[PDB]
Write a protein that binds this ligand. Structure first.
Ligand SMILES: [Cl-]
Ligand SMILES: [Cl-]
Ligand SMILES: [Cl-]
Ligand SMILES: [Cl-]
Ligand SMILES: [Cl-]
Ligand SMILES: [Cl-]
Ligand SMILES: [Cl-]
Ligand SMILES: [Cl-]
Ligand SMILES: [Cl-]
Ligand code: NA
Ligand code: NA
Ligand code: NA
Length: 129
């Protein structure tokens, strides 16, 4: 599923991401935009052999099991395929764990490089929330 900008903002808020660990809704939508272009089915292979899955490109190195990432962990305790569902619940629950792990949203390199410090409020401008 490819979410609309405001559609995704609304889904994220409903699932408790708005201001979660102090990260305003705009931060999450910005991250999703640059990680996946709002596409729940997005995947990308990393140089180390791990794979990133879903709207927030959660990595199989640490967070989900894809059965093809040697020596990895599955800390969200979910198959990576669950991170590609049209329903964002699994991705949101797992992101809550990631953002809580000490480094906040810096875990998402694109967020650090493209969203951090920017006018992220613009990502939710005009949205009925
Ligand atoms: Cl899709
Ligand atoms: Cl957009
Ligand atoms: Cl915001
Ligand atoms: Cl892939
Ligand atoms: Cl992989
Ligand atoms: Cl994701
Ligand atoms: Cl594995
Ligand atoms: Cl594990
Ligand atoms: Cl933080
Ligand atoms: Na905070
Ligand atoms: Na894909
Ligand atoms: Na894994």
């Amino acid at each position: 599923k490819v979410f609309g900008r405001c559609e995704l903002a609304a889904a994220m808020k409903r699932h408790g991401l708005d201001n979660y660990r102090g990260y305003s809704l705009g931060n999450w939508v910005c991250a999703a935009k640059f990680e996946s272009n709002f596409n729940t089915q997005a995947t990308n292979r990393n140089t180390d052999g791990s794979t990133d899955y879903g709207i927030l490109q959660i990595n199989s190195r640490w967070w989900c099991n894809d059965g093809r990432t040697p020596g990895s962990r599955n800390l969200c305790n979910i198959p990576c395929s669950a991170l590609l569902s049209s329903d964002i619940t699994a991705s949101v629950n797992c992101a809550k764990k990631i953002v809580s792990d000490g480094n906040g949203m810096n875990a998402w390199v694109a967020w650090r490089n493209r969203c951090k410090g920017t006018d992220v409020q613009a990502w939710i401008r005009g949205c009925r929330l």
